[PDB]
Amino acid sequence: DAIPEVKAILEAKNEEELVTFTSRWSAEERKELRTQFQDTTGLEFIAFLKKCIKNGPYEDVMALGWDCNISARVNVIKKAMKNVNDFRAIHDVVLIATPDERLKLAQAYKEKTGNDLLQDFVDQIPLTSAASYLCHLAIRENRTPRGSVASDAEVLKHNLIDADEPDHEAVVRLIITSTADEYKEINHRFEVLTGKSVQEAIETRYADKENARGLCIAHYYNLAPARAVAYAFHSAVETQNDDMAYEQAARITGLFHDLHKFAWVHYACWGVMRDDILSRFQSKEANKVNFRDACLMFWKLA
Numbered sequence: 001d002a003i004p005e006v007k008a009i010l011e012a013k014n015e016e017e018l019v020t021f022t023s024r025w026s027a028e029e030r031k032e033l034r035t036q037f038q039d040t041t042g043l044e045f046i047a048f049l050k051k052c053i054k055n056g057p058y059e060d061v062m063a064l065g066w067d068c069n070i071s072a073r074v075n076v077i078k079k080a081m082k083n084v085n086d087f088r089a090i091h092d093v094v095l096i097a098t099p100d101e102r103l104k105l106a107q108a109y110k111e112k113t114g115n116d117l118l119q120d121f122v123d124q125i126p127l128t129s130a131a132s133y134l135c136h137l138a139i140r141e142n143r144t145p146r147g148s149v150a151s152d153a154e155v156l157k158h159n160l161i162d163a164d165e166p167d168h169e170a171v172v173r174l175i176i177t178s179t180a181d182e183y184k185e186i187n188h189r190f191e192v193l194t195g196k197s198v199q200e201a202i203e204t205r206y207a208d209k210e211n212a213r214g215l216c217i218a219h220y221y222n223l224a225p226a227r228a229v230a231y232a233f234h235s236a237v238e239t240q241n242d243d244m245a246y247e248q249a250a251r252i253t254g255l256f257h258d259l260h261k262f263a264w265v266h267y268a269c270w271g272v273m274r275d276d277i278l279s280r281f282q283s284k285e286a287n288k289v290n291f292r293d294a295c296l297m298f299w300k301l302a
């Protein structure tokens with residue numbers, strides 16, 4: 001087919017071709033292609049790419065969108081726990097997911113690493129912060145009605161506003177195991193009481209960035225999975241450190257370009273996703289030079 005073509009693009013490390021090439025293929029087409037390639041060459045397509053092109057945010061976005069979604073969420077979690085835990089990356093993978101998605105993950109993990117996902121969290125992730133409770137509860141509780149809207153709206157405007165130290169497990173559970181419809185209400189109630197949006201109240205209350213972000217992600221998910229994905233991309237765009245912002249931006253693009261392709265509709269809250277991609281990602285560092293376009297391509301914003 002055109003399998004030989006890409007196969008030559010990857011050896012030549014012609015990052016520019018790879019983008020256009022990848023622009024043609026669709027979700028299912030891609031999976032097909034990936035296995036076809038491995039038969040016609042004897043090379044597992046992803047690892048072959050992760051070994052052919054530079055290394056960094058560009059390689060990241062390509063080695064992510066070019067793969068099976070859950071498979072990726074697995075490699076993201078795998079890498080996120082190495083040294084210190086990349087709460088931003090773990091959060092992304094398990095907060096912006098449907099019950100079925102986390103399920104397929106627990107499964108894909110158990111068979112890629114051998115161990116059960118929920119256990120590794122207990123081992124590697126001590127339960128200290130809102131950040132760590134988010135990682136856990138996201139895989140233990142399921143959204144279910146409490147029928148105490150006004151009651152819960154107080155639970156937040158107290159733990160995020162009045163209380164000295166916010167009961168983290170308390171607040172993470174309220175958001176995680178909350179029904180999307182009850183949450184529309186809870187949230188609306190909170191704005192009335194406090195006069196400020198939960199997002200603000202979170203970011204204002206949690207100095208640690210990973211914790212304010214993780215909480216804000218969970219919160220925006222209960223209001224629209226693409227909104228959670230928008231907030232995340234925005235948090236990546238406004239990050240001053242290039243290695244971090246490109247890292248974050250690559251992952252989020254790589255894990256959600258298809259799943260929540262209309263995230264740019266919600267990004268309007270902060271500006272124009274397409275404009276902000278064109279503006280923010282101007283780096284000249286080799287491994288970052290093409291990310292801008294790989295990113296635009298996977299969001300059909302080009």
Ligand SMILES: [Ca+2]
Pocket residue numbers: 049050051052053054055059
């Ligand atoms: Ca490489």
